[PDB]
């Protein structure tokens, strides 16, 4: 989670939109920010917690999906890795 990386334009695009400022993150930042467009954009469900419903959002666009689970955490990381590129530094 101290791998330096750059999200791709769209990706960046949504993290900006909730309050970041940064063009270079870590994997934790990143989904911190992530976190917060779930909250954001109520993509939580209170019914149960354990799904995150984005068919209509964004975020189901570059995760390619409708929905996933929130300890899912290996389909996580492969949906946001296809949405940035590494750096040196
Ligand atoms: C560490 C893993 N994050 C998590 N893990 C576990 C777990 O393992 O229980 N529960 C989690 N609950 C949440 C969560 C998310 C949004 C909201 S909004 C109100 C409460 C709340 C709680 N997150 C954060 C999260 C952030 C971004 C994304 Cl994309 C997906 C999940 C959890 C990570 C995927 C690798």
């Given at each position: 989670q101290e791998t330096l990386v750059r999200?791709?334009?769209?990706?960046?695009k949504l993290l900006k939109s909730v309050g970041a400022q940064k063009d270079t993150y870590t994997m934790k930042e990143?989904?911190?920010?992530?976190?917060?467009?779930?909250?954001?954009?109520?993509?939580?469900?209170?019914?149960?917690?354990?799904?995150?419903?984005?068919?209509?959002?964004?975020?189901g666009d570059l995760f390619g999906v409708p929905s996933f689970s929130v300890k899912e955490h290996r389909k996580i990381y492969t949906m946001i890795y296809r949405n940035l590129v590494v750096v040196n530094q």
């Amino acid at each position: 989670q101290e791998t330096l990386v750059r999200p791709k334009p769209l990706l960046l695009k949504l993290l900006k939109s909730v309050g970041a400022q940064k063009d270079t993150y870590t994997m934790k930042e990143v989904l911190y920010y992530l976190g917060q467009y779930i909250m954001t954009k109520r993509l939580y469900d209170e019914k149960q917690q354990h799904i995150v419903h984005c068919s209509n959002d964004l975020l189901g666009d570059l995760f390619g999906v409708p929905s996933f689970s929130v300890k899912e955490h290996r389909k996580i990381y492969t949906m946001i890795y296809r949405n940035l590129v590494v750096v040196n530094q």
